[PDB]
Amino acid sequence: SLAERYLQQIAQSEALRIQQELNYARDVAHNLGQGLAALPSAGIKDRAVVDKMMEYALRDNPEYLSISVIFEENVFDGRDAEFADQPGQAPKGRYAWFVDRDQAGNYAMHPLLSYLTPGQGDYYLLPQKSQKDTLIEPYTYAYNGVPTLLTSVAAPIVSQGKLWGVVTSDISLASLQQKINQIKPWEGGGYAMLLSSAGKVISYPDKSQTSKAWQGPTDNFTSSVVQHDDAILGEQALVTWQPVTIGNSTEKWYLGIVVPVSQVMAAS
Amino acid sequence: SLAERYLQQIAQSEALRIQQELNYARDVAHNLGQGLAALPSAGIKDRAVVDKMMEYALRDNPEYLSISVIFEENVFDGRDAEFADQPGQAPKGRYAWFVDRDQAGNYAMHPLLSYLTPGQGDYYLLPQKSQKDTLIEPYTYAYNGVPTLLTSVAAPIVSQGKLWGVVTSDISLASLQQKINQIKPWEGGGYAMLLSSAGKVISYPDKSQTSKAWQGPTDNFTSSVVQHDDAILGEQALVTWQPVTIGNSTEKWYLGIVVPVSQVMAA
């Protein structure tokens, strides 16, 4: 049907827009990583140089929560054992650090205490093993004493067959929701929703649903158009899903478009 | 009008896909540039470090022709005078270099001899003046002795108020054409076109129009659908235009979608 193809095409356009936002974040992390891997080749072995490069990347991205960098064991300078148990360092002396902004807006380095533990540390552990770009399931981190729901857009660092580590761009769920809730897919109405790979809510007009498992209408996040009793719109709605993918990832997120049957069938 | 709106939506999706590809190149150049500007701040003043980061950016982008970096005068190391008027260097001893691949496939650094000359050097001169990301009008450079049509995706380096220079990702027009000509906007049929800001043909299914001016019926590059006799399709066709923009560029390219009227009149 012509209406349903048009609806499918709207969903495609909107998934491409949000895909551009997430790829931008992947690119910041991926391109920062390629430059960091060039440093040992050029004879630069000073971890303060990595700190400054990470700082300038965060500086250029004022809405990001932080940038995180994890090199593989010893590959940067060979000195993980010297840092191993010193105060304020990361587990086993690894170059595993992130940069964020303080309450005054100046830039601070903090060690990645979580990077070896399953769950919290998946921003490192999952892409380290797959060597694939990865949109990480939503989780929580306290920045300046404020619990914050976020995702990480993680990019393995691969060059000349060698894994150098992982770089991530750390993105608040709120900032994503700010873009998704602007989407008005049909004559200034309807709404858009965004779901993770595991089907966790990234953005839904009922913010109380954030980070929770979706328990609703999808038939395996189909591209087909399906009619549902929608609680946000309070009427019969048409729903279609489109995938969102970054870099070389094989997994995906799902953008959903929801429009009222009344305004669609009636426009005909 | 529902058919019109769908056609417009198709153009918007195809435009977004091309725009993602051009923005990937903008990002390569922009993000390298931010890393390079960090280096003096960290005490690195060795031009060989810049060489290596450029090489690693090109290595990660085997399809690109080269990556070019032009620093502003003396901003990296203050030593331009020590490199000035030596053969093998760029004009005035500037850090102005590109990296490319040999016929053997290994990486070589070459000076940007043209960075101050109007026309050939616009990849530097135009973004240095506007300080905006810029899709450079298509031009020619002899890589390894072979004239090649390319565009440069140019990203001025700005950090904490200061212009540090310009980085560019240099892309062959052939690779862009190879992507535009796979676009089949309708049922597997029709085609897509790409005009530069100046109306030069970036991509048109007749490649002999490449880089030439477009003396065709564009309606102020309107989203509005317009009907025209089309030579490529050989029938009445519907045309619609959508902008394509990178970074903070104020200028844009235009993707045109062209589909036969007979197949749109179907539904």
Author numbering:
A (entry chain A): 18 to 285
B (entry chain B): 18 to 284
From the primary publication:
We also identified the PacA (ECA_RS10935) chemoreceptor of the phytopathogen Pectobacterium atrosepticum, which binds choline and betaine but fails to recognize acetylcholine. Betaine bound most tightly (KD = 7.5 μM), followed by l-carnitine and choline with KD values of 20 μM and 113 μM, respectively. Importantly, titration with 5 mM acetylcholine did not produce any change in heat, indicating an absence of binding. We crystalized the PacA-LBD and solved its 3D structure in complex with betaine to a resolution of 1.9 Å. The overall structure is highly similar to that of PctD-LBD, with a root mean square deviation of 1.6 Å for the Cα atoms in a structural alignment. A well-defined electron density was observed for betaine bound to PacA-LBD. The orientation of betaine corresponded to that of acetylcholine in PctD-LBD, which was the opposite of the orientation of choline. The coordination of the quaternary amine moiety in PacA-LBD is very similar to that of PctD-LBD and primarily involves a number of aromatic amino acids. However, the amino acids that coordinate the acetylcholine tail in PctD-LBD (Ala168, Met169, Asp171, and Ser172) are not conserved in PacA-LBD. However, comparison of the three-dimensional structures of ligand-bound PctD-LBD and PacA-LBD identified the amino acids uniquely involved in acetylcholine recognition.
